[PDB]
Amino acid sequence: MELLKHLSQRQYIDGEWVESANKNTRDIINPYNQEVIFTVSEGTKEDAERAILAARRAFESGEWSQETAETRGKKVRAIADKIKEHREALARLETLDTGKTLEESYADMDDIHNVFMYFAGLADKDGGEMIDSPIPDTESKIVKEPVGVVTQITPWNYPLLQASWKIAPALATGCSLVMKPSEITPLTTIRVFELMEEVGFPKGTINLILGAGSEVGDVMSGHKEVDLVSFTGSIETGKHIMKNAANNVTNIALELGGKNPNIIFDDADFELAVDQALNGGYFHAGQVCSAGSRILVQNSIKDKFEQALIDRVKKIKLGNGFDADTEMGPVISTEHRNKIESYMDVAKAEGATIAVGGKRPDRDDLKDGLFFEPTVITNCDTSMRIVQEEVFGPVVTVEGFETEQEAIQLANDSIYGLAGAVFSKDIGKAQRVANKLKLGTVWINDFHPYFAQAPWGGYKQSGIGRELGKEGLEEYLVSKHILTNTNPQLVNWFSK
Amino acid sequence: NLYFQGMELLKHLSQRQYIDGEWVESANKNTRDIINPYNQEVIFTVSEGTKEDAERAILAARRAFESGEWSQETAETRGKKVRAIADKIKEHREALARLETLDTGKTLEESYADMDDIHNVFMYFAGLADKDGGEMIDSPIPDTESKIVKEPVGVVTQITPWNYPLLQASWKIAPALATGCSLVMKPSEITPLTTIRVFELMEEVGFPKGTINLILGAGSEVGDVMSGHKEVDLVSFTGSIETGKHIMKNAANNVTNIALELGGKNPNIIFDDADFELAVDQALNGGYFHAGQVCSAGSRILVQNSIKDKFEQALIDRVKKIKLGNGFDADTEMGPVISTEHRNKIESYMDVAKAEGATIAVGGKRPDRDDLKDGLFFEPTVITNCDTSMRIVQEEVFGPVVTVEGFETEQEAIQLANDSIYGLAGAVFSKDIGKAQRVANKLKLGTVWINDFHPYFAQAPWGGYKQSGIGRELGKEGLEEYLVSKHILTNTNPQLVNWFSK
Amino acid sequence: MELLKHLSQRQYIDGEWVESANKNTRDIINPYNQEVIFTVSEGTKEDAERAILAARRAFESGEWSQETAETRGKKVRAIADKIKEHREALARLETLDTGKTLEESYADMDDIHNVFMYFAGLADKDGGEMIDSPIPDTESKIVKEPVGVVTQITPWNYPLLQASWKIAPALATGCSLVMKPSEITPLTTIRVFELMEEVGFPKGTINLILGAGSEVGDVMSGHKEVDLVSFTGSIETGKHIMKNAANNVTNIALELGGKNPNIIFDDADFELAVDQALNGGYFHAGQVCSAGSRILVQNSIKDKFEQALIDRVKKIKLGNGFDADTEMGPVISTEHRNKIESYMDVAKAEGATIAVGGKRPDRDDLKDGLFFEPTVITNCDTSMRIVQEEVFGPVVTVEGFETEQEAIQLANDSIYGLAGAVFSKDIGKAQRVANKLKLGTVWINDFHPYFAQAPWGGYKQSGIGRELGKEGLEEYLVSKHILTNTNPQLVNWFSK
Amino acid sequence: MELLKHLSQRQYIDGEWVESANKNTRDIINPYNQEVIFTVSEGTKEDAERAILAARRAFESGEWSQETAETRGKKVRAIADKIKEHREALARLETLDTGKTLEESYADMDDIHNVFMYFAGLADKDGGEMIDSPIPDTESKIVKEPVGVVTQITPWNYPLLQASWKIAPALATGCSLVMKPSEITPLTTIRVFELMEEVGFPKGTINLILGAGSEVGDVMSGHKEVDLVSFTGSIETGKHIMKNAANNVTNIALELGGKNPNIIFDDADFELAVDQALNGGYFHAGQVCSAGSRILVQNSIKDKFEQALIDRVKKIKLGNGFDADTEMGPVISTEHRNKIESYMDVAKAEGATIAVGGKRPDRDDLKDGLFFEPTVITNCDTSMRIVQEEVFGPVVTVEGFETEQEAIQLANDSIYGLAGAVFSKDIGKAQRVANKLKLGTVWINDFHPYFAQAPWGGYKQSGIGRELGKEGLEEYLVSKHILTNTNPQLVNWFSK
Ligand SMILES: NC(=O)c1ccc[n+]([C@@H]2O[C@H](COP(=O)([O-])OP(=O)(O)OC[C@H]3O[C@@H](n4cnc5c(N)ncnc54)[C@H](O)[C@@H]3O)[C@@H](O)[C@H]2O)c1
């Protein structure tokens, strides 16, 4: 609440904080109590176009695109320092907006700092290659250039984190960007723009559009001047975006959902598996793309595991993200909670069992909030929708498997392939499994970790491209082969 | 004679599709007649596959990929197989070149050069197969091991054009096999000859059942299965912009990656301080090799005003002497265009140009000469008095046609050259190399040639900026379209987090 | 014997097969029976100089150094094909010259083929980099060039194998080379030069000097025109070479000996450990740089292990390398056998036990040959010379250890660091150990494997630089930074 | 000024500032006036050993070597920030100690900052590779580890700059180091150690020895526990160091002298060439390893060029490095000035001409200082010592050439190959030349620039290895190939 007293309420376009073209606004809600906490501009599609054209003009002027990579790196480092300096405030702002615990928000800010720092350090390390030309008397080189104008669209679950993954490499490479956060959670994204403005970037290099994807999204994906669309969100929106981007053969980087398996063998450290099954399923109320919603447990320990998990789920402390006792916060919106509730009806209807949870909590201090009980669904199989689809709530399904081959089959039996885990003390076995899983990230005896040093993204329908790591940077670069003939000779193919 | 020998080849050439290790007919036994553009005679009849055939191939590729017979084979061994394919190309170099000239109509010498490139393309990728399996990352988390493993992407569909059939096919096949993917290829319905032949050769080398598949058919009938089937992990397409957009939209249904190699409106920038005769020679080469039916064609000539009049005159005079004829005759400098339909598009573009106010300085019609009457020939053409706002300048005609525009300054040449939706390739001619470098840096093109025109090679990536494409072919980047990264993170000292209560 | 009827007996200098400058010769001996089997030229130091000057002239002419990398790659591939084509004959020639089994020689030829093929494929893959310059209006690039003239010196144990590791990358990069094999084993090296000549290389690009290192070695290491000395041999010779190479600040790549540990935990697959302890200690009669001469076995199974090993050592079949029943051949020379024998006296004198072997075999069919029984030395410790020094014979020492830390400490307690192994079914433990071992190569549950795809070399005193892999190629390249100022301006630091 | 009042006077060993073991000291002299300005400890060989053993102990404890690369990077960044924070004081300290102008010292500090920043950013970017193993059922990976204990020896010309090139990558990779600056110029090196201590590194990770290479140098190059010797200095000292390092097969990185050509064609921008010839020859009174001491000018403009250069040399303002008017300071020592003077006698005796300078300046305010006039030597040829040898003073030679081929031949006609330049408006020609020059760095239309992003080092006798760039980091890393057999099988080569 104090934090918002000086926070900007507007969009940032072509170096100026401006309102929506039609002065329209939107109320931002705190999911803990559903109170309106802040009011921001609700931009129009013309605002998005104007931002894009400004990014284009700025890119062509070359003030940022022709700046030395070393200097661009120092600026990105400066942004990183700002994140660390305002770490406390940013974490509170994110907990206020998304509802997750304050400790989870602090960890985000540490990651974000590191994300910017990583890309700041990578900026001046690889400018292309020299090729040994197969043509005598020619020089061949590949220069890597910033792709140009980039649109960046993020989700509401980890707003600033997902924003950092896009902004950092865009600025490091010299691109101009136009970013639009989830309409429902713009707070930390607004704040980071204020911070980037303080660091100082050329007019038009960075732009912030605030609005609903349904209104402004198509301009951002289908405008002719966009060279790349980087999107993190749901599969249906990503498909739509890709179809639209095709109108101008615009490259896309998509970071979509997952149906991430958490494979638990009987030779796994049992208490560790239970601990990590809870972590995997319920951090941020399961509103995490890396969530371990699909638990695969070996039959010999399935019954014992289900019991232990259920018993633990019954003790999970729900509450306000600002209270240190809180272990799980509310879900993001009314709409989202409704989808979760409909999924419970779907599960019962297909023949599955709600072993625990599956409803709103009764407790007094939670009535006003968008809470939903941590849930465990049993007696289910791969043919069911509750197992195949991304619920994105505090819900997990438990399936049994007999053999190592069967666990692999089940784990890969989904349209997705973002991330997953394998728990077993037999490391050789965990490696065999990891190798056969069609997942962008595989954890052996762990669950959730990602970091700037390594690429993150999907196999199959969890995405296209990668974020983080050197590959994350490559989404923002384009190669140019400049071939110079040092002893040009007439070919005389067409008779003189 | 050389014609005769090319035609003899057809009597042993397969007429069918290659699916799941078997040469088979179309599911409905339908067929198609292949035509030689030099005389329009039917020269061969092949199967015309159905969409079900394409699905069956895709499912076979999937089954083969999952069995691991190729995907789990050692990279070194995969490299040897790809090298074996390369050796086949060289061994059958003569026959393949004649087959390509017969099918596409381009000169035999141009076809020989293709076969040399193709050999080298396979050889390059054969050598690259076992060189980079991923990375070891220094993890920021103590007591963890972090590594990135690069795996073959899976099932890949490959679609090619009629201009340089085997060349474009090699750019896709080589890295696919080198990385361990399974593939389903469909060449242009109009030119399947060399693609069929290369499959016979790949079969001789020996690959596991389903690893390679050849579908023969029209993109309008089987294309959507190849781009929109759930089991496809990557669609690699080389063709026109409209088809590519359609493909990308369809591939989106399953969030399927795409690599697109589309057209271009490639500038050939000529400064007054360029070696004049060299610029004229390369303007002709740029515009008329393969009758301008080349994606790297220099259709848009930008010449500095001080030498524009002198240049136009020299170019026109040279265009009047270009020898047209049969690709098999050594005297032939330019062959026919590929089809009736395509020649008609070119003819309509001449009407478009006159209607916008441009001038057909020379050519712009079918040649009269007797020995060319039966063929799909079209005269090499030069269009003058035109500007960037015109369709004849902005759009890819893909025929033996070039436009000439003047420019005063270096900045103006860059602006005109970048004033198109495309960005595949281009050239700069000037003896002032520093200037050519400044220009090259500002051109939004995947490939820029300084004092040259046309060269590409396996060692370096080829592809577009802007609407000329997505992704790259050739070079290490060409191989990366066929790989997918996996981050395997191992916690070597796992500890409970105890976030959730007791 | 028939193989030698057409084999050249001369040196190859500046495109010509020539005799020694003083017509001196040397008799080559078959260690199986000590019979003279061939006579070759014994070159003079002036021959070595002439070769070096020819390599220099050839390098400067640019016929090979300026040839396209792609074409160079095809030539190296052609050499590879020759190896495969003459595989049978080469293997027999190596068994005749070195005395190792024919099967071991066949495996060498397969490796060699692959070594050339690997480097043939690597030739045109990396010509340098484009750097993002921190100075505005400048272009910065790094071009990688062949280093120039290279001298290559090899040992008698695996003559052609060690030669291939040097020749392949030298030719692939465009260098000129002068090679000198061990004076006692020149057969396969001569043959490969005949084969390289058939392929065709420009005059002076390749040169073969035949002679004793004590006579011609110093020219090869200390001549001003040499840019790199690549040496594979013993530590003392390497030190001498490095000292001499210093006279002209000449780069060196050294591949020296080792005291390679073979660590066996009690949770190792017991029979596998015994099998690999034998393999590690007795392939090629222990005359291998990767030999597992130092066995470290966990105390709990030490007694059982020693007994099993000893019993197996007593059944090792000695004989002629050409007989299929032969499991271990003779040692290379009288001199070398004598060193091994004196090491037995050294061991007894320090208080160690010759548990088995330690002498020449009695059997009739072995009397004439340079045989020495496979040996096991027990009751020894790290302070002993028999444990610290490279015997390079069919001999192994057995030391016990209690803990994982103690095994690491003992394994690292030597001046060397070439290779080693860890045997345990607990893979996590084997990884912890592997990470702490100061060895260029570590095998987990295996012993001996190397391959072109990966670099091989030492930590500590086992060497300087690497052979094989991309790093192997880098020993033959030198970087040049070409910086172009595209907008040169006077600095005017000094008064006008 | 007051800068020295708080500056430490001692060595830094094993986390403690300590005196020499024998309490011996040394007086530091300001070359501007030859006054003693500071007194520091003069360490013994035992001190150097103790530092080395402390570095070893620290490396094995793993407090720094096992720290995450990301964290190591942050520390190196912290050092970089210290340099920028104390830039003023450091620059004055370097001008006081070395005598060069204050502006030159400020530029150094900017470079140094950037050197540390670059390596800070490179620290966590490449930990090794995954190899596609040719052996089925095996995993192959290459891990890059810090090499271990490193000794670093620097010259007196650019003390802190040369130190930064070694310290930055050493710390970034996780090595322990023992540094010894030139005995005559320890001021900035002492200061940077105080700064590194403030940042905080584990006990023994960094050590500073102060001495005389003739007394402590051999311990630093020949001690068994050293894994790498990084040396920047003269060729004779480097050779000595290499020979000594050989005793323990210790890797060496040598950055030695040069006889750098400055090639000037008749189609060069004339005034630019004259300006850069002066810069190349007289910055820091020619006491720079990248000095353009050997001018090669095309005959058609040779006479005109010599006249213009001479006229400009006559106006060079000599004086105190602290005075803004000063363009060139004094030379470092009496001994060094004497060497320069004897080289003038050598030049006259071989038949060359001292066209201008070649003596001490007469002006009053320079009488007390170690000044020497900027000099130009004409009518000389490649056979002369004045042309072949590194004088390392404010001296340049001028040679004529007719053709492009002749310029290349003359430029490469020396034992060295560190750096050089080509001046011509015909860029294509400058590229042809640059390609043929055997130099680690080639400047086209510029002279002197180096930067962290690109490797610097020599061809031929100018050195071994590289500093700066990724290659600079690689001198501090060693590769380990860990091969795991995932399906181990008995080989059964030996009888059961
Ligand atoms: N590190 C590895 O990759 C590797 C591989 C195989 C063998 N090796 C080692 O090599 C050794 C093989 O034994 P060796 O007896 O052949 O070694 P050696 O040092 O006695 O002989 C090696 C080579 O050096 C030559 N030589 C002798 N004096 C020389 C001199 N003064 N200057 C230059 N060259 C001179 C010899 O003629 C011979 O060609 C063993 O120590 C073994 O461990 C190492």
Author numbering:
A (entry chain F), C (entry chain D), D (entry chain G): 1 to 496
B (entry chain A): -5 to 496
Q: What text appears in the publication on this structure?
A:
We studied a putative BADH from an early MRSA COL isolate, denoted SaBADH, and showed that it is a functional NAD+-dependent BADH that utilizes BA as the primary substrate. BADHs are a group of enzymes from the aldehyde dehydrogenase (ALDH) superfamily that primarily catalyze the oxidation of betaine aldehyde (BA) to betaine; some BADHs also utilize other substrates. BADHs resemble ALDH in structure and are composed of a Rossmann-fold NAD(P)-binding domain, a catalytic (substrate-binding) domain and an oligomerization (bridging) domain. The solution data are supported by the structural analysis and emphasize the importance of the NAD+-driven structural rearrangements at the cofactor-binding and substrate-binding sites for enzymatic activity.
We previously showed that the substitution of Gly234, which is located in the NAD-binding area, by a serine residue increased the affinity of SaBADH for NAD+ and made the mutant more active than the wild type. The mutation also reduced the substrate inhibition. To fully understand the kinetic and inhibition mechanisms of G234S-SaBADH, we determined its crystal structures in apo and holo forms and in the presence/absence of BME and compared them with the wild-type structures. The BME–Cys289 adduct and the G234S mutation determine the NAD-binding mode in SaBADH. In NAD–G234S-SaBADHBME(−), the dinucleotide is in the ‘hydride-transfer’ position, in which the amide group of NMN displaces the γ-carboxyl group of the catalytic base Glu255 towards its single ‘intermediate’ conformation. Thus, BME oxidation of Cys289 and the G234S mutation helped to trap the ‘hydrolysis’ and ‘hydride-transfer’ positions of the cofactor, respectively, allowing analysis of these binding modes in SaBADH.
